[PDB]
């Protein structure tokens, strides 16, 4: 609510030989406008181009107000480095750009200039050194700078567009109808670039979460954004609302759901290796997101774009920093949500969520185990969609595995189907973790029996409470008896296994190998 006024005062009061202090307060204000809901007056302030205005003063330092989080940071770093007189110890091979960005953002978040001026200058110096001497960083800055230069007229035309003529976007949590059409989400190409670009309008009034994530390694899985700015829209009431407009490349391969459906009409031996390629990215993204103390409660195949065979995410409105939130504090899709979430909802006839029940007032989700379940259902939907045109009605039934929809499954499909069951157990504390899943993906070519042994080494069955019955099935399987004579020493353990409220997959698998030996 326009909390920037003490920093405008400090900027004005700063001596003008000390332009590093000036730049520190410009970046501090900028870090705070990204966390601030815009009202009518603050919009015109951040859009003031004449002298005394926010935009006019950023132009003085060659800083683009519409630049992406990363490139606006590097433009600050370039301006600050023009003013530093004491040069730090140059060490490029020892520098991590994400660590520099994170520690810079913590300074802008809560630290006064007197307590951090020198470290604030050295961090920006190191950032600029990467832009000058690191080929990777230099070409990123060169590409975003050029794109931002070629799309400047479109940006001013968007800002220059009438508000009575600006669109109202209706709300819906779906994908069957697809993306709603407004004037801004139309593909286009710029002269000299074969790839098409697109503007997107997000359903949010501030980019506070977006700003934290772009300094973390997990942002590698974000579609590259080239421009960001708030825009006026019309609300349901007709009043003015403020939403971010973000420019990025158009993802040329739709999403992961459509990628799986294309595998139906390809060579079958390609399915399991390609699942490895895609899910190695999904798994690394999840672990990297969890490392930042952020969590994704709406994991599903169609929520992950694919562009140049790279799995990417653009819907980050649902990310939360809360590892143990209540059911009403997260957005998710009920078809892929774990049962601990579904037990907090009420349903009408045919099973549609219509609200929350008593449980939603106290029941919390463990987001890492929540994500493991959804990642498991993403693998299950992927596997099934390579065999069927639509998802089957028994898709949420854990007793109906993904491999049960394969007519001629290979070993890798059998092993991947087992991973689904390990990730989607009912008890969240007994689900395979995403880290364990990441370890086992590299062993998917193992013979099914050897792969089951690998799962036992990674995720021991003792930690599921089934160790008592594992020795009961192993005792009979280690016996020399065969045929019906073995079956009556296997009858007691069999009936003990049919008395399970949810069937434990690991016991269902060992009982069958024991059932085979009984039939002769």
């Amino acid at each position: 609510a326009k909390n920037t006024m003490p920093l405008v005062i400090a900027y004005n009061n700063a001596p003008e030989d000390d332009k590093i202090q000036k730049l520190f307060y410009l970046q501090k204000i900028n870090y705070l406008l990204n966390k601030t809901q815009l009202n009518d007056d603050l919009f015109d302030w951040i859009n003031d181009a004449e002298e005394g205005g926010w935009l006019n003063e950023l132009a003085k330092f060659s800083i683009n107000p519409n630049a992406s989080f990363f490139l606006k940071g590097m433009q600050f770093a370039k301006a600050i480095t023009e003013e530093i007189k004491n040069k730090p110890e140059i060490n490029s091979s020892e520098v991590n750009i994400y660590h520099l960005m994170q520690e810079r953002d913590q300074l802008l978040k809560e630290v006064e200039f007197e307590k951090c001026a020198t470290r604030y200058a050295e961090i920006n110096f190191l950032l600029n050194e990467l832009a000058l001497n690191d080929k990777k960083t230099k070409e990123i800055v060169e590409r975003q700078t050029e794109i931002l230069r070629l799309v400047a007229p479109k940006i001013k035309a968007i800002k220059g567009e009438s508000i009575d003529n600006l669109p109202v976007i209706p709300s819906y949590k779906t994908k069957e109808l697809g993306n709603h059409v407004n004037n801004f989400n139309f593909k286009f190409t710029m002269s000299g670039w074969e790839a098409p670009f697109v503007f997107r309008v997000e359903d949010r009034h501030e980019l506070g979460k977006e700003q934290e994530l772009h300094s973390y390694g997990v942002s590698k899985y974000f579609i590259e954004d080239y421009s960001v700015f708030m825009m006026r829209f019309k609300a349901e009431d007709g009043s003015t609302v403020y939403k971010p407009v973000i420019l990025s490349q158009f993802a040329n391969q739709n999403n992961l759901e459509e990628i799986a459906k294309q595998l139906k009409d390809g060579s079958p031996k390609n399915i399991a290796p390609r699942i490895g390629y895609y899910f190695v990215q999904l798994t690394d993204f999840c672990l990297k997101l969890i490392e930042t103390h952020n969590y994704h409660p709406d994991i599903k195949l169609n929520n992950f774009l694919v562009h140049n065979n790279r799995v990417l995410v653009s819907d980050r409105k649902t990310f939360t920093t809360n590892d143990n939130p209540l059911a009403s504090e997260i957005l998710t899709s009920p078809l892929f949500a774990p049962d601990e979430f579904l037990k907090c909802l009420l349903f009408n006839k045919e099973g549609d969520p219509v609200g929350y029940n008593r449980n939603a007032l106290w029941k919390r989700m463990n987001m890492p185990q929540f994500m493991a379940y959804q990642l498991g259902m993403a693998l299950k939907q992927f596997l099934i969609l390579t065999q069927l045109d639509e998802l089957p009605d028994d898709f949420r039934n854990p007793d109906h595995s993904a491999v049960s929809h394969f007519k001629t499954p290979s070993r890798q499909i059998i092993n991947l189907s087992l991973l689904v069951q390990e990730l989607t157990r009912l008890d969240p504390d007994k689900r395979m973790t995403i880290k364990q899943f990441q370890t086992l993906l590299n062993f998917k070519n193992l013979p099914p029996d050897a792969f089951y042994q690998k799962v036992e080494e990674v995720f021991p069955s003792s930690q599921l409470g089934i160790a008592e019955d594992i020795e009961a099935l192993n005792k009979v399987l280690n016996s020399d008896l065969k045929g019906e004579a073995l079956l009556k020493q296997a009858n007691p353990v069999f009936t003990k296994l049919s008395k399970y409220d949810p069937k434990e997959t690991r016991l269902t698998r060992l009982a069958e190998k024991l059932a085979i030996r009984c039939f002769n």
Binding site: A195, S267, K269, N270, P273, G276, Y277, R310, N445
Partner: protein
Amino acid sequence: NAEATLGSGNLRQAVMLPEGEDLNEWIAVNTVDFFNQINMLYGTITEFCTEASCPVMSAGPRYEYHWADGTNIKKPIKCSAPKYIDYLMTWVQDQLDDETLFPSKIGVPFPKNFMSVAKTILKRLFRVYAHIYHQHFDSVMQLQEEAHLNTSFKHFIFFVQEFNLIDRRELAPLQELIEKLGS
């Protein structure tokens, strides 16, 4: 920054021959896996590998690659990297889809010449990795996928080394990288 890897299980263990497993079958299933990986990874930079960027298939100025045709009797062909690789992927997929060569059924055995077929395939898969690293690592860095490329190449080369499927002289264009990833 440049030699980054992904989290994974221990890849030295993932390429080991499982107990009681036929060596031919272990080569078959991992060859199909590696082909799909390098096929997907080459698809990420394919728009940057053009006729103008790579007029001859190579792995740096010291390693030019010609294509040895399997159906026409003629000197190995000097061609561009897009033409070489776009034909290599179609050529390998045909070997993997052929059930006389890569049998997927229970009672269908591997041919006598399977080991020579698989080693030709794996040799040319290496040539795609080598071309990507030498001529397109800049594009790899712009897509932020050096960890996935290095991890796929790490897995692929650990399997080649485990069973000695590519001659060391052929591995020369990436010997420094193989050593760095295998220390």
